[PDB]
Amino acid sequence: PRKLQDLGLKPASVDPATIKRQRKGKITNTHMTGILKDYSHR
Amino acid sequence: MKFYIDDLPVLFPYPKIYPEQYNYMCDIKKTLDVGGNSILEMPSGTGKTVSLLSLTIAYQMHYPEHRKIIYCSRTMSEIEKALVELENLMDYRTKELGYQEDFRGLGLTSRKNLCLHPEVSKERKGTVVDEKCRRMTNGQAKRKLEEDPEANVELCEYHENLYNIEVEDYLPKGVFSFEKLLKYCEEKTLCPYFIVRRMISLCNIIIYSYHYLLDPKIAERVSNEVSKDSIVIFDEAHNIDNVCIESLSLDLTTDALRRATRGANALDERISEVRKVDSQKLQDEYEKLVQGLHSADILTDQEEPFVETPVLPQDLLTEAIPGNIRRAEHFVSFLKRLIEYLKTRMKVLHVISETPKSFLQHLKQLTFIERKPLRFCSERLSLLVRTLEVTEVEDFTALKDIATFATLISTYEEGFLLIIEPYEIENAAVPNPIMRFTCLDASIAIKPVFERFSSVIITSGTISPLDMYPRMLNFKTVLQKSYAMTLAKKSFLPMIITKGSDQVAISSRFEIRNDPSIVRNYGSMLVEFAKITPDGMVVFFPSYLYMESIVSMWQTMGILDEVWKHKLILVETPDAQETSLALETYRKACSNGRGAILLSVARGKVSEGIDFDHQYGRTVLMIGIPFQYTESRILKARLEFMRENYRIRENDFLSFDAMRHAAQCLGRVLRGKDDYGVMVLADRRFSRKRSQLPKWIAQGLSDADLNLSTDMAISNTKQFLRTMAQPTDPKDQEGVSVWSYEDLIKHQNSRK
Amino acid sequence: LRGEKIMQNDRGDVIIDRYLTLDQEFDRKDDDMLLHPVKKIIDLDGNIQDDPVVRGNRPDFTMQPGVDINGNSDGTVDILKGMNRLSEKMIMALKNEY
Amino acid sequence: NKDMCPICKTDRYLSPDVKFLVNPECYHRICESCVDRIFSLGPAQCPYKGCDKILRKNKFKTQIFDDVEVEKEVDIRKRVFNVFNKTIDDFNGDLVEYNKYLEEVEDIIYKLDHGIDVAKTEEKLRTYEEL
Amino acid sequence: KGNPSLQNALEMARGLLLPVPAHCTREVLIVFGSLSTTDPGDIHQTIDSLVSEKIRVKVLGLSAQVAICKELCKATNYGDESFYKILLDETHLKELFNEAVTP
Amino acid sequence: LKKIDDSRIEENTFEIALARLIPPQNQSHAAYTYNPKKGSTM
């Protein structure tokens, strides 16, 4: 592809892959263990 | 009434008169006595047209010189309105004087609006209507029918009925608006267009558009048939310079040049066929061209050239044809190689801006074409088309454009430009080059008007600033004044909105049309005003593409859904028929109390000529300042030319043009001093331009009313519409805002 | 019919859409009951055709309807005509014997 | 054809470097490659069928107007107006004589264009340019 | 709730004022609070029918001067434009309603 | 190729070609479902 444009013939292909591309701690509320739900998101 | 200004009796067709009308009348009579040109601003609401017509007719009748009257308007609709006011004035004059005096008042327009033939009526283009009328009324068809009655050619009975009557016997005395003239010519089976075109010289007053005085393609008969010492009136002249540009501009595309090549090939085939059949019809034309006979000397009065003369009649040469284009085949080769040179100039990858002299020099260097045959190319093409007697000329039509080009860029060398663009539109994938021959000097078209006529009365409702026009158009004024309209109560409430409801700055710049926040502000503003507006809105947008974007975003979000509960949404379309039907539907919806909003553009068809008086215009919502598209090369070239010659700054002229368009949009809405309506302007750039507004709108615009938000704008509109609905005290306006007869005599005695 | 921009990525419904072009037929018939001559006070067809020989500067893409990359119309003029037609139909529906 | 050179048959998509070259004499569409092919060895006859007029490699040029007959017209105009360089000052301001001179030179340009009476007009041109 | 209709109200008012005798003046008082009206038919025909049956209409609007109410008041009161009343405040509404009881 | 170069060609792969497959027979020994693996940075 990088020489097809040099030869004037427009390629119909994108550049292929050969071209460069990209704790647990203690709990104090021991009398209510298990009723609290995890909330890792808003 | 009947009053006196100096020694002139004026018959005013109403029992009461405004003071501004009397001051206008005094200034017009002073201008016509002293002579020279003038620019006057009448605030809208006041009867500008009726007072102007009243004193002009009185000045024509009472003075023994009997000067004719030219009333130029910018549109056919205001031509009809002026004729209706003329009907009312003439009926009042007949009633007061007890007799119908010798009067002729006729309006002028194209054949498309004055054709009663049942077959050529539904054609959407006036060009084909003109072509069919020429084909059926050239006089060649009449003599072929006389020689061969069995031929398939046809004649228009409306035109043929005109030969049985004399020129003074076409119509009775009086005035004839287009409705009444069309009805009379339908009942009498006559053609109104030829009646008006033959009674141009017999009219005491004639009303036509600016083009018939400025565009030289159709002015060549109208300017000749009118006497030189006539009164000339320019009504709503604030846009007249743009008309001058449209007088002397031309565009050529690749499609137009391909059609020109096809027409040249058809002309070659036709000239070969005529040379094979009958060479005398070319030999007589050739020997007539030897002695130096021009187009007018050979063509009769009842027939017209195929391609109109696109330059001023003063700039056409009186010398003979140089002989390069005298022979038909030589002229065909000349025209063909000119077309191929234009096609060669089309292929370019960058915008080329150049003078006509450089174009002619490069043309002469690349091929042997001189300026002198080009300056007669259109006349030669018209003569060749006439002498060949070709029945169908549609494939020649685009060819006319080339002749127009061949006559424009050859005859003028200063003040015009040529812009060659590889892209007509930027969003197209395929390149579509265009070639624009462009008027930059607005004074070149209007110079024959100011030199031929002795005194003109330029008058627009919203022409501001007054001194811009004597600089932009090369003429001098003996007096300039813009009246301040006198009111017992504030009839109109101009307001400027710079920020939305949430104090976010709003604007109508083209690159920020996709911003959600200004869409929110405009939508909430329009919904609230539509909730409070009693009868009917007119909303003006700066561009139609901006209008499309804002309407699409309103419909996607659901802004228009709340508007649909209160008022019907009606939209201007580029198709003129659908826009006119939408305008009539808007008027009907305002009449029966359903309520409607008319979304239109400030530089389009609706903003010019169409009025929004009384209930049709309770609010004028001016969405943003109406600037043009700055990156277009035409506007930049014109700005550069005016900076070079007329020392006008580019930003100053852009602000002046945007403010005059917004001003005419604001001024379309008042008619009568009982009329009310707010004029809200939704842009942050309006508040700095308050001095560029007309002085009546400026004095109606208080200093506290420059930087409103949305909510207190709604509150001010609520209070204004509550106060204006009250019955006013007749004692509060008996002699300060409107005058009776005795108040007029008292003011005359106080001035003495 | 609501006035939204029509997109080809939407599936729609394969039963109702056969009427779609037929509804387009109705639209031209709507023009056949709406296109009538108007007064000369608001005649904008006479405004444009006041002189047929205007060949001045062509209006730029700001004063013309918007087009896509291929040059055809984007379809917002379709919904503008649709809402104009809906308003015209509502006003003309009042003109009856009621 | 319009896109492809009819001699070497090469298309524009395959070979984007081909260029419009034309013989001023017989006016046949050809590319620069074929010009470097056949006429580099020496003068030869035109590779089109039905045409065998002698033509030279150095005489080759590009057609500006892109139409064959219009190139014929402008090259006859160049071939004629080099010695036909009379102006209005040469006729001492006589407009009618200059107009008839323009008519005559346009007539002889047309005659060299269509070739109807090319012999006597060419002889007249040679006798005029000899002076 | 809803979207008001002048034409339906005026048509039922016309129906109600049909059987009253000719010596009794027929009057319609409208307290119209909205600014837009939706009608099932042509309201100008209803105005013409109200004028032809000698019914006088006085409209006390609440917000602004609607065109159709002003035209209705002007047509049904023999050209008098003073029968379309727009209030200012709370006391002016009492003033208008007290004015309306006089024949 | 005149029509191809004037058009846009999408880059297909095995996963793209899986969207438009036609069954060759009733019972295929090879499963067409892609099995991702951890540690493959090909």
Ligand code: SF4
């Ligand atoms: S003469 Fe008049 S009526 Fe007859 S075709 Fe021409 S414009 Fe129409």
Ligand SMILES: [Zn+2]
């Ligand atoms: Zn080749």
Ligand SMILES: [Zn+2]
């Ligand atoms: Zn050859």
